Design a binder for these strands. Sequence first.
RNA 1: AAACUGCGGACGGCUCAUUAUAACAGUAAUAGUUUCUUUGGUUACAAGGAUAGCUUUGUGAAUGAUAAAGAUAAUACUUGAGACAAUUCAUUCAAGUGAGUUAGGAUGCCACGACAAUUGUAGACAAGUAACCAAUGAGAAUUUCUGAUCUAUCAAUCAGUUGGUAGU
RNA 2: UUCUAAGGAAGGCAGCAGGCGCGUAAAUUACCCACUUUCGAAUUGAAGAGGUAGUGACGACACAU
Lengths: 169, 167, 56, 78
Amino acid sequence: FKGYILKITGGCDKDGFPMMTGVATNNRVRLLLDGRNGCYKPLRNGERRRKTVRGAIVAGDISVLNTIVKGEGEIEGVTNDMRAGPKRASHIRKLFNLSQKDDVKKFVIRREVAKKKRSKAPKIQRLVTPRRLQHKAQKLEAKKLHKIAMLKEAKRYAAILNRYKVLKA
Amino acid sequence: GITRDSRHKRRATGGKKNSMQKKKKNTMGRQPANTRLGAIRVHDVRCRYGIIKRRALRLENGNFSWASQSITKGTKILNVVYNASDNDFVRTNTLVKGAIIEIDPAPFRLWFLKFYGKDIAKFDEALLEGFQSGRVLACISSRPGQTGSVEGYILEGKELDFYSKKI
Amino acid sequence: TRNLIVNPLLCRKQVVVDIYHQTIVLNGFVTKYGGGKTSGFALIYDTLSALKKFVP
Amino acid sequence: MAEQTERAYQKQVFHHHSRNEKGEIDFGNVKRYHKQIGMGFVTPAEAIKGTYIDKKCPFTSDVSIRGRTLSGIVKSCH
RNA sequence: AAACUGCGGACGGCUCAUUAUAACAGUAAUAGUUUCUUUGGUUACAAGGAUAGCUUUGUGAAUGAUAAAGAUAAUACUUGAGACAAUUCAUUCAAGUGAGUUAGGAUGCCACGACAAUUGUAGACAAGUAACCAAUGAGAAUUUCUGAUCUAUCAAUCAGUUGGUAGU
RNA sequence: UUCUAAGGAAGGCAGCAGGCGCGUAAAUUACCCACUUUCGAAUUGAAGAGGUAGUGACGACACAU
């Protein structure tokens, strides 16, 4: 067919060993792998292992190449074409062209349930509910303690101290 | 790794010391970092108990204190002219404690102009020569391989004569 | 019988049963050698809400 | 002058400048630091009048004297 | 449920190969170091990206094997007002303790920089978090004094070895 | 030492049971967290730590004919 342009984004060897993006050889190499570059999922924390991988250069030994932009093995092909949507309110304003002041609950993505009822949507985050100031339910509010309810003590306490330090007779 | 235990040494009687255990992290040492002179380059090293040590690989600037005038200024380091431990530290311009170094007294001169109204370019004679020559003598008093900075002081009367005669 | 411990913290009464021969739990009962006397320890769990709550 | 025989400049652990007759810090001299150790030990006059420099001397440094105390006879002084 | 995050697997359990002042026991010091946990204190009507479990396409005989893409959260990662503390250096005023230019104060400078942009509707009360003091800590770690079996067909041993200065 | 599709891969019983060997010489491939206590986001979950059971003329005590 007409064909488009694509960029290679992954692949696996004939033996299932993946291809590392950084590695620039054709054959297989053994490297000390962490979870940073992906090709090894650690069990403990800070645990490395010497695993075998393939280079980023394509060759005849490759069995499947994810080279999309597909999932094609190598003659064949195969193919990949909103599971949950955003959750933060700030994200809702971005997607539906909503300003800061307008309500977004009217524009929350609602999904129905069809089984032997309910119109479901995520739990919202970061809005304007009166108890959103639970964030200040008080929660904030309760800098009080801090706010001189304690701090003035630290000037109550201080002051009367310099009194019986000055008798000193 | 490098070890600091005394189990690998000999006794005061000269007898060899036999081995019962293996190396342990308690007596672990680390490779020295010879702080040279150049572009700023520091690293953070996790020590024991999680504390962080600032390993200064390379530095150029430093804070130096004038005892007589009771001031401290930041200053660019020019040269290292005397190291009382190893002469190889002089050529490589290695920054360590007690290393007599040469710095440009530009901020100190400017401070003198704004405070007395005069220019330096009683004070000991060799101090004046350093001011006019653009290179004054200072001694590093911090541990750059541990604190990650060069803190020092400008040399003065009795210390200046001793170190100047050494050069 | 024997001694009483009033234990409202565990909502419980406990006695040392001294036999001279659902709220009830009996444990640690053994006779004396040669028959006759039998001893033990009793568990008064009163309300049937502690018994379940405070019972393995 | 006679104690400066090493490659570095020898200073006391606690070196401070004295005040001149006019009542201001005199940077031209350094006070001879000398402390007194504890359980009934007198400081020798050499630690006061003398001009030697030592960073391990119990009388003119920050080395402390702790509980254990013994006695003996000098064997070698080489 | 699974998954991200946090904590733990450095405790407990087994064995006695190594080891001849080494280890261990009593003793004394840390004014020569010091965490974790727990305990007592002290110091903007709320912002930014992407990631797993999730969906989809897969490879390899196979491991507690692994590749791509599409989304989505934070007490995960960051920025940011709320207003000091702790480090290094130089100078200096100095009281408990057997003993300290010592805890501490003052001057100038650098780096660091806060008390979740946190969580229960229910069991304001909670709960959580960062640094810094102190306890836990007669703990851990180094170190002081004294103390070991046989052997002289083992009588001289040691060259970082013993000390000094400067540094690392 | 083990698996393998022959390309490759993990594993360290001086942990509890158990097996081979060695030797004159030494026990069940059991059940449960109920006791003691430890860890954890915690009153609840785990624990071959721990407890109970099986073999046991190593030993110790009382006691038949």
